[PDB]
C-alpha cells in the first residue's frame, strides 16, 4: 500500500482480533490484553460500504433490442449487427476489468491509510511519554496500569500526568 503500514512496517495481521479491523495490543505490569478500535474500524467499513453500494447501483433496463443469434447466413446487415454487439461487449468487459482494478487498488490503499491514521493519532496522544520502535509499537516510558491503557484507547489519556515520570526514564 501507499502508506506502508499494512504489509509494511507492521509485519503482519492478527487472526486473534475477531471484534474489529484495527486495534491495540499491550504489555504492562498487570499482564497482556487485546482490544479493537471502533472508530478506525468503522471508517474503513463505511468507505467500503460506500463504494459497494455505488458499484451495485442498478442502472440498465433494456427491452426491445437487436437480435444477436442468427439461423441463416445473410452477409452485410448481420455482420454489422454482430459487430455492434461484439464492440459493446468488449467495451463493457474493459470497463468492468478497469473498475475492479481501480477499486481494489484504492480499497487496499485506504485500509492501509486508516491503519496509519490510527497510528499517527496514537503517537500524537503520547507526546514525549513514548517512542516509536518502528514496527507499529510504541515503548511507553512509565507505569501504565490497565486504567491508563484504556485511557489511551478511549481517548482520555492526559500526557502531563505521566510526563516528568516518563521524561526522566527516557534520558537516564
Amino acid at each position: 500500500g501507499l502508506f506502508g503500514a499494512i504489509a509494511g512496517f507492521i509485519e503482519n495481521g492478527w487472526e486473534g482480533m475477531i471484534d474489529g479491523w484495527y486495534g491495540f495490543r499491550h504489555q504492562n505490569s498487570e499482564g497482556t490484553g487485546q482490544a479493537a478500535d471502533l472508530k478506525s474500524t468503522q471508517a474503513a467499513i463505511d468507505q467500503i460500504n460506500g463504494k459497494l453500494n455505488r458499484v451495485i447501483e442498478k442502472t440498465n433496463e433494456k427491452f426491445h433490442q437487436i437480435e444477436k443469434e442468427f439461423s441463416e447466413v445473410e452477409g452485410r446487415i448481420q455482420d454489422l449487427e454482430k459487430y455492434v454487439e461484439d464492440t459493446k461487449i468488449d467495451l463493457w468487459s474493459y470497463n468492468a476489468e478497469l473498475l475492479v482494478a481501480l477499486e481494489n487498488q484504492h480499497t487496499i490503499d485506504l485500509t492501509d491509510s486508516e491503519m496509519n491514521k490510527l497510528f499517527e493519532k496514537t503517537g500524537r496522544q503520547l507526546r514525549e511519554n513514548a517512542e516509536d520502535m518502528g514496527n507499529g509499537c510504541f515503548k511507553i516510558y512509565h507505569k501504565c496500569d490497565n486504567a491508563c491503557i484504556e485511557s489511551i484507547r478511549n481517548g482520555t489519556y492526559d500526557h502531563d500526568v505521566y510526563r516528568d515520570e516518563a521524561l526522566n526514564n527516557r534520558f537516564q
Binding site: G1, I6, A7, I10, E11, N12, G13, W14, E15, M17, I18, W21, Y22, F24, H26, Q27, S29, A44, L52, V55, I56, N60, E61, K62, F63, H64, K68, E69, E85, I89, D90, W92, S93, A96, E97, L99, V100, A101, E103, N104, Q105, T107, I108, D112, M115, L118, F119, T122, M133, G136, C137, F138, K139, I140, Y141, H142, K143, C144, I152, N169
Partner: protein, 321 residues
C-alpha cells in the same frame, strides 16, 4: 518498569484473491462477486407478462395458423418462441421476415379489428387442405383468399380510410401459383398484380408462376407484406389477380414489449431480468450468462468472475512451516 503498546490490524485464515492496478493476484480479507454467472433455468412469470408461444411463432400467431388461434388478440411484454414450433397452414414466406417479427414483437399486441372490405365480383374465404380447420379445408384467420366468381376476376379497387387516432397495421399477401393452368384457373388473367398504397408510399408485387418445394400439400406459395396507415391517411388495394386480402387491421402500441427465443420453462417466481437460459438476479452489475437479455439486467461481459475487494490486505503471521 515501563510498558509497550502495539498497533495492528486483523487477518483471516481463508483469504480471497483480487486484481489491482499493480497485481494480477493479491490476497485480501474478503471480496464480493460482480458477475452473475448462473441462472435458475426457468423464466419467472412475474413481473413481466410472459406469453409462451408453445407450438407457434409470433408470425404464425399473427397470420392465424389454425393451431395458433388460441393467440388471437393476445398481448405480452415478452413473447417466447420455442424451438419446437412449426407452421401448419398454407406455405408462405415473408420478405423482410425479421422486420415484421420485430415491429409486431415491439407492438406487444395481436389485437385485430375486422373491417368491412367489399370485394365486388369475386369468391371469398378460399381455403386449402394444407391449412385444415376442423375437418374441412381452411386458411389463415386474418387473411381472405380471393378467387374468381363465375368465370371473371374484375379489377378489385377498394379503400379503407383511417379515421381513428391510432396507427393501423394491415397484413396482406400475394399468391404465387405453381403452373399457368393454376394461375388462370383461379384468377382468369394470365398475370396478376397487387398494388397496396397510402398517400405517402406504395407497394406493387407481381406474382411469379413456378414450382417450389412441396410443403404441406402444395408447390405454391403465399408471400406476406405489411402496410401501416397513419391517422388521416387512407389505404387503397388495387388488384386484378392473386390478392390475399386483409380482413382488417392490427392495432399498434408502443412500449416495453419484445420477443425472445428460449426453451426455458416458465415458472412462478419474481425476476426483473430474463435471459434465454432462464431468469437471473440483478443485484450484481455484470453478468456472463447471456448477451441476450430482457428487463432490468446486469451488463453482459466476457469475464465469468470479477472480485471486488471488501476488505484490507490479508497478512497472516510468518509461518514456521
Amino acid at each position: 518498569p515501563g510498558a509497550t503498546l502495539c498497533l495492528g490490524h486483523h487477518a483471516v485464515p481463508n483469504g480471497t484473491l483480487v486484481k489491482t492496478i499493480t497485481d494480477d493476484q493479491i490476497e485480501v480479507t474478503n471480496a464480493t462477486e460482480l458477475v452473475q454467472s448462473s441462472s435458475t433455468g426457468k423464466i419467472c412469470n412475474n413481473p413481466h407478462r410472459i406469453l409462451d408461444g408453445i407450438d407457434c411463432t409470433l408470425i404464425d400467431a399473427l397470420l392465424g395458423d389454425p393451431h395458433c388461434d388460441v393467440f388471437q388478440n393476445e398481448t405480452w411484454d415478452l413473447f417466447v418462441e420455442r424451438s419446437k414450433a412449426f407452421s401448419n397452414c398454407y406455405p408462405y414466406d415473408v420478405p423482410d421476415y425479421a422486420s415484421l417479427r420485430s415491429l409486431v414483437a415491439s407492438s406487444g399486441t395481436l389485437e385485430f379489428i375486422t373491417e368491412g372490405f367489399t370485394w365486388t365480383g369475386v369468391t371469398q374465404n378460399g381455403g386449402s387442405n394444407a391449412c385444415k380447420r376442423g375437418p374441412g379445408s381452411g386458411f389463415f384467420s386474418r387473411l381472405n383468399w380471393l378467387t374468381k366468381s363465375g368465370s371473371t376476376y374484375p379489377v378489385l379497387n377498394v379503400t379503407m380510410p383511417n379515421n381513428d387516432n391510432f396507427d393501423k397495421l394491415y397484413i396482406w399477401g400475394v399468391h404465387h401459383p405453381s403452373t399457368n393452368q393454376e394461375q388462370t384457373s383461379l384468377y382468369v388473367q394470365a398475370s396478376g398484380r397487387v398494388t397496396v398504397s397510402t398517400r405517402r408510399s406504395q407497394q406493387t408485387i407481381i406474382p411469379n408462376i413456378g414450382s417450389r418445394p412441396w410443403v404441406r400439400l402444395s408447390s405454391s406459395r403465399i408471400s406476406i407484406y405489411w402496410t401501416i396507415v397513419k391517422p388521416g391517411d387512407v389505404l387503397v388495394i388495387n388488384s386484378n389477380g392473386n390478392l390475399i386480402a386483409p380482413r382488417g387491421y392490427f392495432k399498434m402500441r408502443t412500449g416495453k414489449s419484445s420477443i425472445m427465443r428460449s426453451d426455458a420453462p416458465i415458472d412462478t417466481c419474481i425476476s426483473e431480468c430474463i435471459t434465454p437460459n432462464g431468469s437471473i438476479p440483478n443485484d450484481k452489475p455484470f453478468q456472463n450468462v447471456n448477451k441476450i437479455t430482457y428487463g432490468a439486467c446486469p451488463k453482459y461481459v466476457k469475464q465469468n468472475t470479477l472480485k471486488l475487494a471488501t476488505g484490507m490486505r490479508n497478512v497472516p503471521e510468518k509461518q514456521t512451516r
